[PDB]
Design an enzyme around this catalytic site. Structure first.
Site, PDB file in Angstrom:
ATOM      1  N   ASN A  70       0.791  -1.266   0.007  1.00 37.35           N
ATOM      2  CA  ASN A  70       0.021   0.037  -0.029  1.00 37.35           C
ATOM      3  C   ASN A  70       0.832   1.300  -0.051  1.00 37.35           C
ATOM      4  O   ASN A  70       1.828   1.014   0.460  1.00 37.35           O
ATOM      5  CB  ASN A  70      -0.946  -0.001   1.191  1.00 37.35           C
ATOM      6  CG  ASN A  70      -1.774  -1.344   1.336  1.00 37.35           C
ATOM      7  OD1 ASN A  70      -2.558  -1.585   0.287  1.00 37.35           O
ATOM      8  ND2 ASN A  70      -1.837  -1.953   2.392  1.00 37.35           N
ATOM      9  N   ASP A 107      -0.730  -5.917   2.259  1.00 37.70           N
ATOM     10  CA  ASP A 107      -1.827  -6.690   2.328  1.00 37.70           C
ATOM     11  C   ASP A 107      -1.259  -8.189   2.170  1.00 37.70           C
ATOM     12  O   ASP A 107      -0.911  -8.381   1.309  1.00 37.70           O
ATOM     13  CB  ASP A 107      -3.058  -6.278   1.746  1.00 37.70           C
ATOM     14  CG  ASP A 107      -3.742  -5.143   1.811  1.00 37.70           C
ATOM     15  OD1 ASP A 107      -3.455  -4.522   2.968  1.00 37.70           O
ATOM     16  OD2 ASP A 107      -4.376  -4.577   1.034  1.00 37.70           O
ATOM     17  N   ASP A 113     -15.571  -5.651  14.317  1.00 37.44           N
ATOM     18  CA  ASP A 113     -15.102  -4.453  14.811  1.00 37.44           C
ATOM     19  C   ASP A 113     -16.204  -3.215  14.371  1.00 37.44           C
ATOM     20  O   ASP A 113     -15.798  -1.953  15.065  1.00 37.44           O
ATOM     21  CB  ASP A 113     -13.705  -4.108  14.123  1.00 37.44           C
ATOM     22  CG  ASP A 113     -13.816  -3.391  12.961  1.00 37.44           C
ATOM     23  OD1 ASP A 113     -14.945  -3.292  12.444  1.00 37.44           O
ATOM     24  OD2 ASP A 113     -12.504  -3.162  12.420  1.00 37.44           O
TER      25      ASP A 113
END
Ligand SMILES: [Cl-]
Ligand code: NA
Length: 129
Positions: A46, A52, A101
């Protein structure tokens, strides 16, 4: 390992993802297709320097430790390399934390842009589960 579509569906079902936090199995298979093309060894870097990892492209900024993302968290308490295994257990267990979350599957950009609001049941059609 590069999974087949129905092979991955069966593996995810066995690991408890079907209807996890209300997301049907097809959502998870669709996300994996567009995040990694079903390849457990996928990695992508990124702009902020994070990376990732794996079949669900879990980010080192928050979820795993790769030793080169300064000031990052490791909320799944695992080395990022564990996410590249042919055994998807570590990836599934971490994904359960992410989807819980508060933001659901919107954490996965490819799911939001390419799976959300489509007929995701098509991704498990024909599979012996
Ligand atoms: Cl949700
Ligand atoms: Na990290």
């Amino acid at each position: 390992k590069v999974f087949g579509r129905c092979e991955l569906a069966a593996a995810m079902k066995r690991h408890g993802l079907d209807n996890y936090r209300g997301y049907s199995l097809g959502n998870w298979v669709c996300a994996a297709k567009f995040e990694s093309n079903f390849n457990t060894q996928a990695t992508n870097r990124n702009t902020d320097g994070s990376t990732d990892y794996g079949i669900l492209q879990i980010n080192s900024r928050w979820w795993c430790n790769d030793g080169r993302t300064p000031g990052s968290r490791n909320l799944c308490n695992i080395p990022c390399s564990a996410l590249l295994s042919s055994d998807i257990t570590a990836s599934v267990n971490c994904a359960k934390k992410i989807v819980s979350d508060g933001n659901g599957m919107n954490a996965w950009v490819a799911w939001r842009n390419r799976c959300k609001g489509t007929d995701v049941q098509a991704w498990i059609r024909g599979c012996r589960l």
